[PDB]
């Protein structure tokens, strides 16, 4: 499982988006019998929290998920070639750390809950 | 919950595929206050790992999941009547233990990631 882990860390975002399963499979597994257990418990919570995010968004069970949130040029004005072909995910995460929680809120609030309510109303027509 | 657990272990695979929820519901729950806790933690990890497999495949949230991996006669030449009507899951698992990781790799690599990328590209047409 470990093999290939973080190998595309220095690759472009496009090239590094085809190895998502390699990172995904590496997120899940005498006081030293307690502390290690705590670490195991910690890993589970982190995994579940990320999965919870994917579930409050319409992204449950997916590694690549398309959404209805428009991109804002304030978050980033770079082209697609300057993000996917000429840029790595670490650089992108360093720039967009500043805006992550606005995008997360837009993902959580407007799009998924309005889409879910609209499916609730279309299903009773 | 426990009632009916593994009851279809000796039944045919077809008959035993209608009781999947009975097994699914039984997977989730002083040094003896630590060891038991470790066991509980262990159960969670196992559950999550299986769920993780189902998520890296296109099978999240399903107990029966159809895929795009063709069956290979090298894995098994038996008919459908000799698998579903005249055979149990333990016998099937004993034969196909030898081939499980090839099927798992084909499930993980070609079909789900190519399908996910193709949906990523169809959604922008």
């Amino acid at each position, epitope marked *: 499982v470990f093999l290939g882990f973080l190998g595309a860390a220095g690759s472009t975002m496009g090239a590094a988006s085809m190895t998502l399963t390699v990172q995904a499979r590496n997120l899940l597994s005498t006081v030293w019998g307690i502390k290690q257990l705590q670490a195991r418990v910690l890993a589970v919570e982190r995994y579940l929290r990320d999965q919870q995010l994917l579930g409050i968004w319409g992204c449950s069970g997916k590694l690549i998920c398309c959404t209805n949130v428009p991109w804002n040029s304030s978050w980033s004005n770079r082209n*697609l*070639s300057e993000i*996917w*072909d000429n840029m790595t995910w670490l650089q992108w995460d360093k720039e967009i750390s500043n805006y992550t929680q606005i995008i997360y809120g837009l993902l959580e609030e407007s799009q998924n809950q309005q889409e879910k309510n609209e499916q609730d109303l279309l299903a009773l027509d | 919950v426990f009632l009916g657990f593994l009851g279809a272990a000796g039944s045919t695979m077809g008959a035993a595929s209608m009781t999947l929820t009975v097994q699914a519901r039984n997977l989730l729950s002083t040094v003896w206050g630590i060891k038991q806790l470790q066991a509980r933690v262990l159960a969670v990890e196992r559950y999550l790992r299986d769920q993780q497999l189902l998520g890296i495949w296109g099978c999240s949230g399903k107990l029966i999941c159809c895929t795009n991996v063709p069956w290979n006669s090298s894995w098994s030449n038996r008919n459908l009547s000799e698998i579903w009507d005249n055979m149990t899951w333990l016998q099937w698992d004993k034969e196909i233990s030898n081939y499980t990781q090839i099927i798992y790799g084909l499930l993980e690599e070609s079909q789900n990631q*190519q399908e996910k*990328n*193709e949906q*990523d*590209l169809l959604a922008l*047409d």
Partner: antibody
Amino acid sequence: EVQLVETGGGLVQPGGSLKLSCRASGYTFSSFAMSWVRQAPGKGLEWVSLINDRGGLTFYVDSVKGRFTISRDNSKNTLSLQMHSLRDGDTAVYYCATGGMSSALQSSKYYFDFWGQGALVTV
Amino acid sequence: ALTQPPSVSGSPGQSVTISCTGTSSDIGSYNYVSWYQQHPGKAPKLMIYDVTQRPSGVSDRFSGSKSGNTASLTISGLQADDEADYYCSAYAGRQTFYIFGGGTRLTV
């Protein structure tokens, strides 16, 4: 530099099964989507089929949807079109071209950028 | 299919505006109208894409524009070497992709 060169073109009868092959050079073949577009001798251009950069998504016009089959090999840089049950309306110069779509991670390429010499097909 | 004038004419140094009319589902729904120039005996060449955008190597004399459900190709500075059949291409959705118009005979 982009050189598209079609072959396999000739003459066939109704019900024929004709295979064309377009060889590409001068650019990254696997990075671009490809299309086949046809021109009847006395008419204008008609789009026939589209295949994406990975060769997994194929699109056809209704008139050929169940008869034509676009395909690609990215190691050999070869685009191919297999037409079965050829009809009298399929007589045309067929051209292979680069473009028609792109993946979500690229800019839109809803146009045919580069073109081939063409290949005459008489049913 | 798109409706396009069968032929136009213009004297050298003058400017012509080939037109192109489509339904609202294609020209009036997507801003993806491209223009191709085909000389007799050769294959088309992308003069314009995305309504107003020119491939590199293409002279500035060729320009495009849209108006509702109509597109146009303004060819200024007409030269003898512009004598070609011009074609429209509009993107028309996912159930159908590319619709071409008829050819326009340009004479000088």
